[PDB]
A paper describes a structure:
RAS is a major anticancer drug target which requires membrane localization to activate downstream signal transduction. PDE6D binds to and sequesters the lipid of cytoplasmic RAS and has been proposed to deliver GTPase to recycling endosomes, which is followed by release mediated by the small G-protein Arf-like 2 (ARL2), allowing RAS to be trafficked back to the plasma membrane. Here, we present a novel strategy for targeting RAS by stabilizing its interaction with the prenyl-binding protein PDE6D and disrupting its localization.
Within their HVR sequences, both HRAS and NRAS contain a cysteine residue in the −5 position relative to the modified C-terminal cysteine. We were successfully able to cocrystallize PDE6D with C-terminally modified peptides of both HRAS and NRAS. In one complex, the density is readily interpreted for six amino acids including both cysteine residues, while in the second PDE6D:HRAS complex, only the carboxymethylated farnesylated C-terminal cysteine can be confidently modeled. As the electron density for only one copy of the HRAS peptide can be modeled, it suggests that HRAS, like KRAS, has conformational heterogeneity when bound to PDE6D. The cysteine residue in the −5 position is packed against PDE6D and not solvent-exposed —whether this would occur with the full-length HRAS or this result is due to the potential increase in flexibility with a peptide is uncertain. As the −2 cysteine is solvent-exposed, it is possible that it could be targeted with an irreversible small molecule. In summary, HRAS contains two cysteine residues within the HVR, of which at least one (and possibly both) is solvent-exposed and so could be targeted to develop an irreversible inhibitor.
Residue numbers in the entry: 2 to 150
The structure:
Amino acid sequence: SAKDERAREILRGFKLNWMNLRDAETGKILWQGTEDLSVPGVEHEARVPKKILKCKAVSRELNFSSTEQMEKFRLEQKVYFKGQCLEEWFFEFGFVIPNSTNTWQSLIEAAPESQMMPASVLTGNVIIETKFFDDDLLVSTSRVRLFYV
Ligand SMILES: COC(=O)[C@@H](N)CSC/C=C(\C)CC/C=C(\C)CCC=C(C)C
């Protein structure tokens, strides 16, 4: 469309290879996926162990490939509970070499146990909406429904 064919070019050349969730304090891998949760237009599912809610902070690794150059690769994540936006996250990777494969690590600090909701209430009710950007270029929007198992 009129909005850059480059955005569509980046998307066709972009692949999310795998993703990790780690205990930020110990480095134990708590959850791993190899499904491209960045694919737009379908509601992905993620089933993560309930024990993750025990962590004070988690480290999320995104390993991605991109045939296309990007000047300022970043993402915006809204966390929804039953359609209510609870959290808005911003993460920047920066410059993406064309044809590169990159591991992207981010630290997610957890809310206190006394302020965070139980797994039984959260599971199936949390939607993460991720917008993938090259600076101001919206490359894709993806939605993942969270289950705590
Ligand atoms: C430690 O307590 C917490 O902070 C709990 N509430 C969550 S830890 C963190 C994150 C997740 C669980 C889900 C992370 C996001 C996923 C799997 C999907 C995002 C999609 C993309 C493509 C980045």
